[PDB]
């Protein structure tokens, strides 16, 4: 028992890859509880480097996934690779490891898969692994700024909720797009756009924060930026331009299950950015008090926000509170905090974290969001307000 969780890594591009700059550090501070033991990447060439650059002592590299999926040295594998390849990958990992039994945890990232269906399946599947805990990466949930809200409310610091208001930004579905940005982000069919990811991330944290799921809801999706601007590496725009399929703005309203509390939410695609308002805001109207979170980057999942709250200390004498944590690295800090939740339970199976404070979210979570996201999609399309009170099942 008591010795490092060994992580197998899928999507470890190099010493300057996403994961590299996030997951690796979540594990370096938990060197004590996690060791990285295997890197999958198609060309061996690439794992070995990664290793030599990162100095992954315990790392041993793969060429085959199946090759990978079998190393009984991996208690837990982390798949952080394009969502579109999300289905392919995972699926196999699942069928090839059956024999492996230390593999005890399979971590993956929002969105779990690229289409509900796709995901549904991977879920349907995950299920058989009686010994398998699945983990979706909704780092939203672990932000000091969320938990804090969560705390505040739960303890009736703002009474019952009345209304909620929301604002976001996809960032790249603006009138501007960056040199580096993956074409697939903007390729419709991708299964990667505003809602799915950005908003899915968002909204969930609020179902998460309020700790209530949706009952009914309505959505409307726009596509008024049909061709955007290309930006030179520095951000200087350039006379060059390209088409976009993924949508530029989405409106959504719905009535929360708990309270029939109503929800307003307008999500901008990207640039230009709101200049008279925070591009990221949660406005909760309680009975005894108010709670406002604000970021300039709608990437709460990644973002270091600030929280203003005002109401009763405990829960007539209202009080003001400003929760901002200067220089907190949310970018990395937040995956780290999930890793913890895992060691916890580990060095200390689950269904979903749902509304719970401890633990961490699962494919069951991954799913519900997922399922609820279709809803929004079917909604706009059907131009109808549908009940999302079965999703939780």
């Amino acid at each position: 028992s008591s010795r490092p969780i060994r992580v197998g890594f899928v999507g470890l591009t190099s010493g300057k890859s996403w994961v590299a700059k996030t997951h690796f550090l979540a594990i370096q501070q938990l060197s004590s509880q996690f060791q990285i033991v295997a890197l999958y990447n198609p060309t061996l060439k690439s794992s070995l480097q990664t290793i030599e650059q990162l100095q992954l002592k315990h790392a041993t590299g793969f060429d085959s996934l199946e090759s990978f999926a079998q190393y009984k040295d991996i208690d837990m594998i982390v798949v952080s690779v394009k969502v579109p390849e999300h289905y392919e990958v995972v699926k196999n990992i699942l069928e090839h490891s059956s024999q492996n039994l230390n593999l005890r945890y399979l971590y993956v990232e929002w969105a779990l898969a690229a289409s509900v269906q796709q995901a549904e399946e991977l879920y349907s599947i995950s299920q058989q692994r009686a010994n398998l805990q699945t983990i979706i990466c909704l780092q939203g949930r672990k932000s000091p700024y969320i938990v804090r809200a969560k705390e505040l409310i739960s303890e009736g610091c703002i009474g019952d909720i009345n209304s909620i208001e929301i604002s976001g930004n996809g960032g790249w579905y603006g009138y501007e797009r960056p040199m580096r940005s993956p074409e697939y982000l903007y390729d419709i069919e991708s299964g990667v756009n505003l809602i799915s990811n950005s908003f899915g991330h968002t909204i969930d944290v609020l179902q998460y924060i309020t700790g209530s799921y949706f009952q009914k809801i309505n959505a409307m999706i726009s596509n008024n930026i049909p061709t955007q601007f290309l930006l030179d590496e520095n951000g200087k725009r350039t006379k060059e331009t390209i088409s976009k399929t993924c949508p530029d703005h989405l409106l959504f309203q719905g009535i929360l299950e708990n309270g029939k509390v109503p929800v307003s939410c307008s999500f901008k695609g990207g640039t230009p950015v709101k200049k008279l308002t925070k591009n990221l805001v949660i406005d909760i109207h309680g009975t005894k008090g108010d709670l406002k979170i604000e970021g300039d980057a709608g990437f709460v999942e990644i973002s270091n926000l600030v929280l203003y709250f005002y109401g009763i200390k405990n829960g007539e004498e209202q009080t003001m509170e400003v929760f901002h944590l200067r220089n907190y690295n949310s970018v990395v800090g937040n995956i780290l905090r999930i890793y913890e939740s895992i060691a916890d339970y580990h060095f200390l199976k689950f269904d979903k974290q749902g509304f719970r404070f401890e633990g961490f979210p699962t494919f069951k979570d991954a799913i519900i969001l997922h399922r609820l996201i279709d809803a929004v999609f079917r909604s706009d399309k059907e131009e109808k307000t549908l009940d999302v009170s079965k999703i939780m099942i």
Binding site: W18, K21, N169, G171, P178, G235, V273, N279, E294, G295, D296, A297, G298, F299, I302, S303, N304, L305, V306, H324, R326, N327, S330, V331
Partner: peptide
């Protein structure tokens, strides 16, 4: 003073 997250940054790390 608030060190909040600017999208400009976001773009760098992502």
């Amino acid at each position: 003073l608030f060190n909040t997250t600017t999208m400009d940054d976001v773009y760098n790390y992502i």
